[PDB]
Design an enzyme around this catalytic site. Structure first.
Site, PDB file in Angstrom:
ATOM      1  N   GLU A   1      17.579  -0.228  20.159  1.00 49.79           N
ATOM      2  CA  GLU A   1      16.821  -1.474  20.225  1.00 49.79           C
ATOM      3  C   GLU A   1      15.569  -1.328  21.076  1.00 49.79           C
ATOM      4  O   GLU A   1      15.635  -0.887  22.220  1.00 49.79           O
ATOM      5  CB  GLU A   1      17.705  -2.597  20.768  1.00 49.79           C
TER       6      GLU A   1
ATOM      7  N   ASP B   1      12.917  -3.737  22.427  1.00 48.97           N
ATOM      8  CA  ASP B   1      12.437  -5.086  22.663  1.00 48.97           C
ATOM      9  C   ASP B   1      10.953  -5.058  23.008  1.00 48.97           C
ATOM     10  O   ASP B   1      10.565  -4.809  24.152  1.00 48.97           O
ATOM     11  CB  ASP B   1      13.263  -5.784  23.748  1.00 48.97           C
TER      12      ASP B   1
ATOM     13  N   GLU C   1      10.055 -10.423  24.540  1.00 52.65           N
ATOM     14  CA  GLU C   1      10.939 -11.535  24.820  1.00 52.65           C
ATOM     15  C   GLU C   1      10.240 -12.400  25.846  1.00 52.65           C
ATOM     16  O   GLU C   1       9.953 -11.940  26.946  1.00 52.65           O
ATOM     17  CB  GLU C   1      12.265 -11.027  25.355  1.00 52.65           C
TER      18      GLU C   1
ATOM     19  N   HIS D   1      15.918  -0.052  24.706  1.00 56.20           N
ATOM     20  CA  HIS D   1      17.354   0.157  24.877  1.00 56.20           C
ATOM     21  C   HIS D   1      17.798   1.318  23.987  1.00 56.20           C
ATOM     22  O   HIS D   1      17.971   1.134  22.783  1.00 56.20           O
ATOM     23  CB  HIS D   1      18.152  -1.077  24.453  1.00 56.20           C
TER      24      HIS D   1
END
Ligand SMILES: *[C@@H]1O[C@H](CO)[C@@H](O)[C@H](O)[C@H]1NC(C)=O
Ligand SMILES: *[C@@H]1O[C@H](CO)[C@@H](O)[C@H](O)[C@H]1NC(C)=O
Length: 437
Positions: free
Chosen positions: A211, A213, A216, A227
């Site tokens: 992942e 990101d 956010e 991640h």
């Protein structure tokens, strides 16, 4: 999952662009699908298979039985989920009323009716524009990449008859077990409702994934967080093999639940991202995320992630880290090592490969997620506000935003901001420095 017939599945279409060194950018057609977890799951002529946070015990005694008995169905994107598209723009509303009460959504960018648009951004850049001005603390408009399968798990699990069309095959670094359908089967076996969230529960199986990101945020705070996972593509988990924030031991698993985050507020500069500030959250902004490699080519190792914004004709770079000794404004191996060290968070990042690993996920295809939600696990206090709430403010890494410890409790934000929404637009993908200026 099998396919119902009560409503047809119509993806609201969206354009995006592919750039070249020139600065020239060509328009690519795409469309948006809602995650299968937001769908009505019903029997031949249902009769729900799943209501609130509890499965139907007669229809779904087992995963195999529930897979026979239950059907996914088409989604009314606007009237039910508060989802619309406008040329290059996508809008996701927070609270939407119809027959039922809908909170937020998770969606994916598709290339055509049956396949997710895979992105290959190693050595490249990814850019988009966003309006967070109508978001508040407790809310999180997330835009990120995950190592999903293009088809939504059809090729690997033939029992899945819906696929990417009906938004199947989700996974991430939290290795989530709240997904109703995982790997061609239901996840009703060993289901346990959530303690605080009346819509979710957790079965015996989870969906691990790398992942990245990219974004956010809300109008008070933002976070860029890779991640990594031991292995990159979608892996299934058994119960306590999972780890992740949902489980009772978040680090006993194959993926990194925390990641190497970069939050300007958390790294010291508390006048950079916010209303009326350097990067002004009251107005639309372009968010650039370069992915530098060793040799500056698409084949090298992920050396760095750089962040640039563009607003009102001015390029504005990522603000520095005033935390000692956490240097720079870029996510790197050395920054991440010292970050976790100086903040005192377990270095799960390095344990699962770090940026090298995260590059490997990016080297293969990754699918674009556009989502908006409130946080039942941690009231979103890790993004805005101080976390943990008990620790001293001035302790390094504790304060991530200017918001109250008491705010972000789902019931309040749902009651306070029912007309809240995010807007993702102007998605461009190309070589470094090719999507802006
Ligand atoms: C969707 O795109 C994929 C990847 O090129 C392709 O395999 C599939 O057949 C496409 N579907 C169409 C064109 O209907
Ligand atoms: C906060 O970040 C901005 C943007 O880089 C910078 O101009 C300012 O100097 C920073 N604050 C401090 C105290 O360094």
């Amino acid at each position: 999952q099998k396919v119902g017939k009560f409503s047809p599945e119509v993806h609201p279409p969206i354009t995006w662009q592919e750039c070249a060194d020139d600065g020239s950018c060509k328009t690519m057609n795409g469309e948006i699908v809602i995650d299968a977890n937001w769908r009505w799951v019903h029997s031949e002529q249902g009769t729900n298979c799943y209501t609130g946070n509890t499965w139907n015990p007669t229809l779904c005694p087992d995963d195999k039985t529930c897979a026979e008995n239950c059907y996914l169905d088409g989604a009314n994107y606007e009237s039910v989920y508060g989802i619309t598209t406008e040329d290059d723009s996508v809008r996701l509303n927070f609270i939407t009323q119809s027959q039922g009460k809908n909170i937020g959504s998770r969606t994916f960018l598709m290339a055509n009716s049956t396949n997710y648009q895979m992105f290959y951004v190693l050595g490249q850049e990814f850019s988009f524009d966003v309006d967070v001005s109508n978001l508040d603390c407790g809310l999180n408009g997330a835009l990120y990449l995950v190592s999903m399968d293009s088809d939504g798990g059809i090729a690997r699990f033939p029992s899945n008859e819906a696929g990417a069309q009906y938004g199947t095959g989700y996974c991430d670094a939290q290795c989530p077990r709240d997904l109703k359908f995982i790997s061609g089967s239901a996840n009703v076996e060993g289901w346990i409702p959530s303690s605080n969230n009346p819509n979710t529960g957790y079965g015996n199986h989870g969906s691990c994934c790398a992942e990245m990101d990219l974004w956010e945020a809300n109008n008070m705070a933002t976070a860029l967080t890779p991640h990594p996972c031991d292995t990159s593509s979608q892996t299934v988990c058994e119960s306590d093999s999972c780890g992740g924030a949902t489980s009772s031991n978040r680090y006993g698993g194959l993926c990194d639940p925390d990641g190497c985050d970069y939050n300007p507020y958390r790294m010291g500069n508390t006048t950079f991202f916010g209303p009326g500030q350097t990067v002004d959250t009251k107005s639309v902004m372009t968010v650039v995320t370069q992915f530098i490699t060793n040799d500056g080519t698409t084949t090298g190792t992920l050396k760095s992630i750089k962040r640039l914004y563009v607003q009102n004709g001015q390029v504005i770079s990522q603000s520095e880290s005033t935390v000692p000794g956490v240097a720079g404004n870029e996510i790197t191996e050395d920054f991440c090592h010292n970050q976790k060290q100086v903040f005192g968070d377990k270095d799960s990042f390095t344990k699962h490969g770090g940026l090298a690993a995260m590059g490997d996920a990016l080297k293969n295809g990754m699918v674009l997620v556009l989502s908006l939600w409130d946080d039942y696990l941690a009231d979103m206090l890790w993004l805005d506000s101080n976390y943990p709430t008990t620790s001293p403010v001035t302790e390094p890494g504790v304060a991530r935003g200017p918001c109250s410890t008491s705010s972000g409790t789902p019931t309040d934000v749902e009651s306070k901001y029912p007309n809240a929404y995010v807007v993702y637009s102007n998605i461009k993908v190309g070589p470094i420095n090719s999507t802006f200026k």
